[PDB]
Every structure is written in C-alpha cells, then in structure tokens.
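Margin note: ligand = iron/sulfur cluster.
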Amino acid sequence: CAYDGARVVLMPITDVIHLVHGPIACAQLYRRGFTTEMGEKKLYRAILELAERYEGQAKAMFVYATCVTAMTGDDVEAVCAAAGKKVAIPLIPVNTPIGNRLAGEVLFKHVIGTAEPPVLGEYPINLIGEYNIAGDLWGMLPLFERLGIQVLSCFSGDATFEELRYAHRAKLNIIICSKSLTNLARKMQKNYGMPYLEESFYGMTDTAKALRDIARELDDAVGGLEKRIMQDRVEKLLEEEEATCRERLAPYRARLEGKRSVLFKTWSMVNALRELGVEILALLQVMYDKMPDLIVAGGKTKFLALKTKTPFLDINHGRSHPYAGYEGMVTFAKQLDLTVNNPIWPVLNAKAPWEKTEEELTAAVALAAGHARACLDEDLKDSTVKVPAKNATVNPQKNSPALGATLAYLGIDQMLALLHGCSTFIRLQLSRHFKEPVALNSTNLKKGLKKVIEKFSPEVVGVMTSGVRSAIVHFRQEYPEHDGVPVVWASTPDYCGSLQEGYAATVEAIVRSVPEPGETIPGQVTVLPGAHLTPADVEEVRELCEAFGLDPIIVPDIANALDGHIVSPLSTGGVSMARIRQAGQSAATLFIGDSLAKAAEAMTERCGMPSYGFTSLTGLAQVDRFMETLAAIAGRPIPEKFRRWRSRLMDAMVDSHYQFGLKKVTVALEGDNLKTLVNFLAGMGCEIQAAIAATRVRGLDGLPARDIFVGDLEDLETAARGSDLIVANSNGRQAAAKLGIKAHLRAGLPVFDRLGAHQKMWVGYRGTMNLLFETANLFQANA
Amino acid sequence: CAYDGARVVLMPITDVIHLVHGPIACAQLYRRGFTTEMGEKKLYRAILELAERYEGQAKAMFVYATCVTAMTGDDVEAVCAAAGKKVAIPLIPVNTPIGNRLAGEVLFKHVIGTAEPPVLGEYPINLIGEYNIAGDLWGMLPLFERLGIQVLSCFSGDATFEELRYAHRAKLNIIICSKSLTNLARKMQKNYGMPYLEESFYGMTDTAKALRDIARELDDAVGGLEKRIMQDRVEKLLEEEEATCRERLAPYRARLEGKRSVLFKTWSMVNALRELGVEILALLQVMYDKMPDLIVAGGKTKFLALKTKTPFLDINHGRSHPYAGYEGMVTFAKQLDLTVNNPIWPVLNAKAPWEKTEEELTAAVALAAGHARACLDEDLKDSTVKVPAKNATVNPQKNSPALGATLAYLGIDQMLALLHGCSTFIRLQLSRHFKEPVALNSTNLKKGLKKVIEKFSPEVVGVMTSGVRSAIVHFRQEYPEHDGVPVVWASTPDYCGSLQEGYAATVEAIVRSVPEPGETIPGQVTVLPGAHLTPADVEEVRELCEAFGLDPIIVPDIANALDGHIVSPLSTGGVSMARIRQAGQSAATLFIGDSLAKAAEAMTERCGMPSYGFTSLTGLAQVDRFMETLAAIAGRPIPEKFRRWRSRLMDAMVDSHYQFGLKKVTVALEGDNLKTLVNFLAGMGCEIQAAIAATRVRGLDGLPARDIFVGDLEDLETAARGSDLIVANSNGRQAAAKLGIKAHLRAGLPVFDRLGAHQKMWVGYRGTMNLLFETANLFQANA
Ligand code: SF4
Ligand code: SF4
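Resulting structure:
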C-alpha cells in the first residue's frame, strides 16, 4: 500500500493530532490516535471537535486517507478546504494522489518553508530518516552539539512540527538510511540548493566516514575548504571519542572473546560484532554441529530463536536501547554481554530429569543423600564470614529464638506452648505476620503444669528454655493421671540466635522424643520443612509429594494451622500426635534447609532411615533435584504436569532474563532464606552487592555475592547504596526509603505491611515462576 | 515490671537515641532501637559510638536498664557520670531505684526545666499522656490553635525533647487519662504551681466538659474569671464545631440506625455508639440468639471476633485512625459504617455448598441451567446504556474482532488461520501479550488454499471474513484429496465490535461445524471458556473439573498453546480435532461468559445437551455456584481441598475488607471481564465510579456502578477523576499518569508492560484470593 509509508513517516510527529478517516482495521500527543467512527461531513465534525478539545496542545492536524476511505472516494482535499477556514490550526491532507514519495511530497508542499527559524546558526543540518528508536538520535545529538553543528530538523524523530517547518534554511541534508525519502532530498536540492549526503551512523568506521563527509561539505558551504574549521574540529572530537569508547569497550571485549554468532544495516552490525571479537559463522541439528553462542537475527523471528535455547539479540525497530554513536554501541556491547554471559543458559541447556541416564540420576540422588553429612561435617570455626565487631546494634533483624520455637510448636495439633507478660511480644509479631490467633500461655512448676493440663486437656506440652528434667519427672510422678501427655523441652544455647536456630532446636527436640521406631511403611516420607517456608509452600510440598504416590508426614505442619482457616486455648490445625509417632516408620526423611540437617541425623542414628537434603526449592536445577529424589524414592516416573510446568518456567526465565541482567541487589534475610534467594537471583543474572545474614550459618562464604557479612538492617543502608533491589522483611522499608530504592521485595518474617505474605508460594516450578515474575515486575515498575 | 512503664512512656520520644542495656529478649529516629550486644565499659563504648555516629540527628540519649541488666547490677548512673563529660548530648539514666512513677520522676529530675521556652504565649498548656495514637492529638491541635491556646509540651506524642524541656513555664496540666502520671502532675504542682485537670477528649460531651474546665482554669490563671475571654471563645467554638459535626454525622447516622452491638474509655465509646443510634445489647449460640451486628470489643481478642463471622471494631493502642475530637469521631463513624455496612457479611454468612439442603442446590443448578436462555431472551434494543454519541474516538480500547477470532483459532491444534501484510498488526499484539509465536498466514482463492494445505498439511483451516460458500465447495470440488480438511468460516457482522464479539462468533462457528452427535458419554463435560480468561485460568478450570472425576473438553484450549511452552507454521498445543468432534457427546455444556451463551445454545438445539452458564468464576458466591453445578453433574460430593480453600478465601476477605472499603475505582474493560471485576469489587465494598465498556453488551445496566457508559480510554480520564484505582489494559497507563492515579490493575488484552500477565490465575477460590491480595496490596502501597 502507500498510506503505510506516509503513516510510518508522519505519525511519529509528536505535537500534532492524527485523524485517520475510516476503520481501525487497516489502522506526547503522538500516542493519541484519532479514528473517525466507521463521510466528509462527519470528518468536518471530527476536525472541528478535535481542534476545539485539544487546542493549546496541538499545533497541526494530519488527515490520513485509508484503503477503506479511498474506496469511498471522499476527497480529503475538499474537507480540508471547507474546514481550515474555521479552525486555524494547520490541517495537512494526506491523500492517495515507494510510500515515502507521498510523505516527502506532502511535507514539502505543505509543511516545509512555512516559518523562518528562530535561531539559525552557522552550521544547521537536517537529519532525514531518524526515527529516534530508543534514543539513537539522542546518542548523536551531544556529538553534534560539541562539534558546533545545529540539528534544525529531525524528520520522524523527536520531531516537533515547528522544528519541521524550518528545513528551508539549512546547508546539508543527511539521509540516515531510510533512503526512499531520497526524492525529498533531491527535490529540496533543486528548489532550496541543499546538498544531500547518505550516511550511516552505526559503528565507529561508518560514524567516522559520516563525520568526515559532513565536515567537508559544511566547510564548503560555510567558509571554504580553505581555512577548514570543521575538518580540524571533527578530527579532534573523533580522536578523543574513539579513545574513550575503546577504553570503555575493553572490559566487554574481554568477556565477549571467542564467542560464535550466527547472523540470519547488515554490514554495520557485522563489523560491530567483529570489533567486539565475535566470530560470525554465517535447523536444530545444524546448530548442534555449529555450536553457536549467539543469534543476531534481529528480525521478528525472535520467538523461534528464543525457543531454540540460545542467546538471541535483536537489531530492528523493536529494540529498547540506543545503538547509534559511541554511547549507542557501548550500549550494544553491554546488551550483548548481558544476553550472552547470562548464567541461565548453561542451566537451560542441561539435561531434563526424565532424559538423564540412570547413572546420572543415581549420582544426583547420592548428593541429595549426602547433603546432611556434608552440612554436619562443616564446622563453623574455619568460616571466613565476618563476626560482627560492633557494640550497639540498631534495627536488629535478629528475632528471638523463642519466636522460632513458637512457630514450630504452632504446627502441632492440640499443643500447649509454655514459655519459662514478657511472652506477649512473640504473640503479636507472629499474629501480625499470619493474621491469626496464637496460643503462648506462659508460667509452683508442677502446680501450674497440673493446672493447665486439666484446664485445656492437651495431648502435648511444649516447654522452651534458654540457658529441670527432675521437675518434669516430678510433675509426672506427683500425678500419673497426666503421665500420657508428652512434654517436649527445647533449649537454645546462647540467646545469641534468630528464629532459625530456635526452630531447628525445637524441631530436633520433637524428633528425638515423639517418634517411635517400627517397621518401614513404603510410600511414607517424613518432611521436615524449614522456617523460611510459608504455609503455602508447605501445602505445595505436600501436593508435590502426593502427586508421586507418597504419603507426606510434615513436622511441623503450619500449612493448616497458621494459614487462613476458620476455638480452643490450644493450637489446632497442625499435625496430630499419631502422625508424628508413626513418622518414625517412614522410608526416607526430606528436609528443606541446611539448619535442619542435624534434625535429620537425629532420626538417622535413631532408626536408620536415609536422609535427603535440599537447600532450596526455588530455581530450575534445585526443583529438578527434588523431583529426581522424589522419583527415586517413589519408584514412579515424574508426572507430566511437572514436565509442562518445567517448560513454562524455562520460557519465563528466557523471557525475563533481560530485566534481571546486571542489576544490583542487596539481600538481608536469615540464613536459609538468604541462601535460597541469593542463589536464585545470582543464577538469574543479578549482581548481588551485599549479603547480610542474621546469624553465622554454614556455607555463607560460598554464596555468589561480592560482600557477605553478618549484620543488622543499618549495615543494610550502609551497604545497599546503589542497589536496584532490596530483599528483606518489612523492617527493610527503613533502609529503602532512606536510600531511595523503590524496589523492595518482602521476604521472611516479619512481613506486616502487605497482605498475603504467608500465602506467597515460591516452591517448585510454579513457585519459581511466581517469584521470577514478582521480581521482574518490581524491576519493570521502578525503571 | 517497672521498665515497661518507663519504656511505653519514654520510648515514644522521637528525636532521642534509646539505648537498651541488655538482651532483645525482654525488649523519625524513634523507630531506631538501639540494643547493646549481650558491661559498663561496653555501655561506655556504645554510648560514645552511638553519639558520634548519630550526631546532628539526636538531641539526647536514654539509657534504660532492663530486668537482665538490673540482675547484673551495673550501675547506669555510674556510666552516665563517667561518660557524659565526653559527649555532651544529654544522657538520661533510667534506673530501677506503678511503672509511671519512674517515668515522671526521671522526667522531672533530668528533663523538665532545662530550657526556657522560645515562644511562651498567654495560654500554654501541657498535655500529659497523649500518645498521638494514629493522630488523636492531631485532631485536637487545630481546635486548641483556633482557641488561642499553646500546647507547650505533649508528653509521649509527637514529643520532641526540646518541647519536653519547656514544661516548667505553663499554667495548666491536662492529664488525658494515662493517669499513673498523676504523681508527676502533683509534683509539678508543688514545685511549679501548675493546676492539674484530668480530662478525656473522646466524645462530644467529654470534649465539652474538657474545654469548659480548661477555659475556666486558664481564665483564673490569665486575667480573671471576670472578663472571661476563654469561656466566651470556647462557647463560640463549641457551638460551631458541634453544629458542623452533627451535620457531617447525619449521613452516617442514617446508615447506622437500629444496628445492634455487643461491647465486650468504656463509657466514652458507649455514648459515642449510642449517639450514632447503635443499641448496645450488653459463645456462638448466644450470638445466634442475640443476632449482633457489631462487636466493639476493641481488645486484642480481635482474631476470635473476626473468626466469629461478624463485623468487629477495635478501640485501643492498635487503631490506625484518629478518634479524638470532632474530626476523630467523624472518622470513628466512617470506620463503623465501613466495617458494618460492608457487602461481604451477607455473603459470608450464607450457607456453604456442602451444608445446603437438596432443594436449594436444585434451585441453584436450575438457575445455572437457565442462564443461557436468560441471556438470549434479553434483547439489546431496550438497553438504557448510552450509545456513544461522539464522532472521533481517541485511545480506542476496542480491539478488532479479528484479534478475538485469532485468539480462538490459536486454541485449536494444527490450525491454519487464514484472514481474507494488513494482518501483521494482529500478530504483534497477540504475541506481545503472550510472548509467543502466532501463525496468521493471510491470502486465486482455490489456488492459494491448495498451496497452503499441501505446504503445511493441516487438519483444519480457519477463515474469518467481516462483511464464498460456493468458493469453498469449489476448492473441495476441484481437489478431493483435501476434502477431509475442515474449513471453519466465521463472520462478524458490522466491523463495529471488539475481541469478545469475534471470539464468540468464531467459537460459535466451530461449535456448529466440527462436533458430531452421538451417544452420551458420562463424565464428559464440554467447557467453552471466555476470552477474558487467561491460559492459567483455563488450566485451573480443567483441574477443577478433573478433581470432580469429569473429563473436560475445552474449546478452544489456549492453556497449552498460547502459554509458556517449548516448530511448525501451524498452531500447536491446542485441542485436537478428535476431541472437538467427540465433544458433541458430552453430558453437559459449561460456558464462562455471557457472550458465549449463543454458542451453548448452538449445541443445545443440535443434540440436546443441557447448558450451564456462569458469568464469572471470581468471588465466593460465583465459585460456590460453579462447585454446586459441578457436583450435580458429576454426582460426587465436593472435594475437601476446595472446602479448605473456601475457608482460606473467607479469612482473606475478612482480613482485607478494610482496604477495599469505600474506595473509588474506575473500570474500563471489555464486557465480560468488566462484569466480572466490577461485580467482585462492588461485592468487596468498593465504590465503582465509572464502568466503561468497550461495546454494547447485555446486562450492562444492572452493574453495581454509579456511571456506566460505552466508551474509550479518553472517557476514562474524563471520568476516573478522584478514583483510587483504575482497572484497564496496559494502554490505561495513559489515563492514570495524567490523573495521578498510582494504582493501576492490568487486566484484559493487551497487557504488554508487565511480565506474567497471561499467567495470572483469577479463577476459583485461590484465584479470587490472588486477585484480592493483588488489589489490596495496590491499595496499601499507594496510601
Ligand atoms: S487495507 Fe489497504 S491501506 Fe490498509 S494495510 Fe491493507 S492494503 Fe494497506
Ligand atoms: S524480663 Fe523483666 S523487665 Fe523484661 S518484660 Fe519480663 S519481668 Fe519485665
């Protein structure tokens, strides 16, 4: 067609109303499209009304005829003549009588020459064909400003109508490709005596030729070749800018050496890639034997290239970054390094769990089985992580271990949690995170224990002390009516730990006391979830285990107690005592979190069950290991729903790795959650500036972070400077607001400022997808 | 204990560093807590360091001794003496030698009297015991300013240390409850000669007594009772403010008349409730016979009251709204009307699907069965919704019907979608919403049809025209090798519709052509999903149907095709042709969306299957009807997982109705999605300002909105003024940024600015919970 050319050239004008006579089919005010209802009188009406409504914000109005209306035959010239004398904002008719002819012709006949420019320097130039795609003209404007050259008119870029009306007084037309306006260049040449130069501004060499030719012709026009001023000035600028851009490109040269690319202007991108040291080789199997590292078909064939599981780069009208000039090609190299050196590609090209050979699956299962002994063999004395050397701590993210002990006792059904008004503070915090009632009756010892067990008739009593066995045996002695009720006694050794240490200690105490050994029940697995798992994650873990045909006994089960559910002074909803007792007959023990390793071993030496450990269930490889271990335990193949979900997560990772790449993130959480989220973010391409841990835990030095320290949330604001994302609890809204970081991901406990924190599922393929999309949208909204 | 009183009184001071010697257990700079590591030398070190670091932002430092340290016996007076001479920011020791004694005593001995006030008017007063809880002092400060009285010191409110050091020069102490500082009031009385008045500022009557007594005593102190100025001024202000507050309370009086409340200061809240016309009557069955409408136990017994399925109100230190003064009690009435007149309570107190009698379930199933005939019997000629009277449309949210036809053809496996370069625009938009390849090859007719069917070997061809049967029978005639391949021909009648009309038309065309009638297969249900459902919703619908033991045949199935999945020029992943053919033997037909009703009837008269219709699957009652219909079709009871999820959704609705209440929302979507979201938001308590629909659809006038019109996204910015939330597609980021609305919920198509839009599940109990939490967090972040 023809109106498509006139559209793509004239619609980019940003201070004009574009009226499109006819249907939507076939079809900052530049973002206001104006379409007439399904007609020359109606177009008269629309012209009048749009002029009156958008007066003061519009400087002109373009009336485009479309395929449909041209068939109707309504003469847009007639309505222009019959309507312009009423509203005086200039109306330009674009009629049917190379689509870029029509554009150049209407532009000369009606737009160019209607206003003498306000400021006409000694070096005005007109750039014809610059669409300012993601600021490619913006990378060249400072160079032209430094050179002393004036851009009087940029056609189809940040083009104001007034700027376009000045093109009559200039000396050089530069056609930045978009050649088909060569007719306009030739026609302004005859009438207005303006030489035209067809230049490309993509690449060092082509930019050099462009600037040299421009300096030459403007030296002819202004002054003479003799006394060349522009030639010397361009030589000087060229030298300095080339030096600076080589110096800035060297780091990216080092990272992008020896990589192989397939290319499917063509030359400009070629030589740019060759400069960066990328060998251009030139259909799945031909790629397999090609082993390409990059696909630079910048075409709209994207989605195919993305699904080929290879890094892909796009050089077209759809790019969202400037590639023109020295800064533009620095950006080009940066985006290349982002998309090619991303950590996701080796993970994505790894073998799926269902296509691994039996030997590899056996090795992975063996690693999962040895996780517990690996954590226990690590001893913290050799840790290089820094002990906090402060004296006064401010903003302490270190919660009390009694909070974790309460969280674990809350997952057991009909539990009386006893602490021995100073206990209130635990109740309010846990309630506010969970928006749920919690029972923490606190405490003569035997008398009170009697009192409670009669009043509430519990089937288990949870006693936690920091810093008595005879007293408990005394209570049992004085009254054997209550002998049946078990008492679980948990101790945290230094009142120097957080929620995680208390949770681990009380879970270990439960594991050592309640379960009884017996004959192994096939299909039964004991799951010891970590404190970093929300109730939704525990429910999802149960569902994943049940999909494999296994019976999950989860100790503790906060997924039904401290989750939204709809009265006794005991805790209800958790795992019953019969289930905890029969959990000692399970075939295997699974724990999610390093801190629980000891607890798992507490079972291993008591009965002999194998223990399988997983640091995290977020990230493709970690969920893959979990599924492999579950398939090995159950003896069944992996269900196909999980195969579909893995494919979905792969697609999401490919599509969202552009927002995570080379972003600065500071994470301040407790040990296990910190490990999980730091590993996930580092595997998705983020640069972790600081890793702030609540307490000294195992494996902190191996985290993929620049700075790892044990600290509070004031060290957060001391170290999160320059970060694009902050991951922490709600208390982190301190350090963000101070540092101006608008991206804060709420994780861990407490999270009291947002609703649904305990219902956030970040486990498995769908949970990883949810976390991925949440973080990607945080990056999108704050940029 | 005692340090708890000194803490609750002295810790609110906002410009002082609070150093707490000892453990965290038992324990705007006011939000900086400073705790010493697990010690008088160490406290010396901490004092020095905290003074040097936070210098310029701190005016003093409080060193509190705790239960633990007092047992250690380290004399905080000794460290104060040994450290104050080094850093001169005043250090105040709070030691052990009614917890409010200690507070008043340290305050007099060290804080009060250290600085003459800068500006001491003729009416300074000291308010003792005002904690500025959510701004209760803030509602009284303008009244005191208008009266000409100066608040020289507010103890424990927005209390700056300098403000506290001035209390030595004043005439009246007013104890705003918090009595236990009466010792401080008596002790300032002896030394500084300042009368103390115990007043309450909660309620019209008590505020009146307070202001009268204050005017009297300050008239004694300043001037004489004779020439009373303050008495006359308070009379004047009292009259005007009482009139204004009665006038503002009348609307809330009308809405809160005859309601019954149970109350579990006590008097002040009583009389306030009685003023508002609420009868105070004074344990589930005693409530059943009490039929209470409101529970005003403002205690921390909240969670129990919330779970009693009754409106609950809280009057304590945890309230997040000011209740003092006339404005404070206007706020009280507003919050009462919000929590009592919410639409969620009648829905929440309705019978669950598993506890309904068989007759009620039969009636609900009959309504679901008659949905289709109800929609078809409605004819649009009588609709009161306004036809758009404009001539030029700007920001057209009306997508082309070819977009919907493409969306439906994309859900069929091995489909060649033919339209007869003008077709590109559909491909880019659908791809950008779905980030997935789409195939829309467009078109001598028989020659081209031959060409394609050989090249791509499809099993179905989709032809869509707007505004030939012999030509199709010609292609079949000329070449019977391709006779088997079915051709589906869809027509939208006026090129005056949106995605929804095209989707419905092509689904109706598929239903009339492909399915074949046969013998009814029990357990098979044909699901016709609406265009407003994302692929995740289609997958969840399939899972809900499969949990009941039913086989869902979903036409079309975009959940596997245009969802993240990992090449042919045809569309893959959708529903195969054998399944669509055998869908004509289903026991029942379910359609989600009014626009699909016709399609359902297209089956009903072709074979005879019953059709069940559901406008939306968001909201407790709608999902309840869906589950009842599914249970009736399958003949099985409702699975218990869904019972747990219903309980979770109920809890979430109770907990989140405070953020949705009386909020202003403007929704601009297509018909079915608009109905769904408008009904959900209106049922959760929001005030829908404007309902902007893309096209004229059935049942638009019955929507719970103030203004319903068919319009574009410019009418959105014309009508969304004053709205707290905007629901629309990504193009809505226009009208929000113009109007300053920072809360924009992305719904419908296209959604190109955020990742994971097509993976958003808003169906069923968990989907309703997800939508609820997303909207609640949007309201929380932008307020
Ligand atoms: S309808 Fe016409 S003007 Fe519109 S895109 Fe197609 S051939 Fe071109
Ligand atoms: S430990 Fe002591 S000061 Fe702390 S809350 Fe308990 S009794 Fe009070």
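Residues A 422; B 1, 3-4, 26, 66-67 surround iron/sulfur cluster (ligand 2) (CB under 6 Å).
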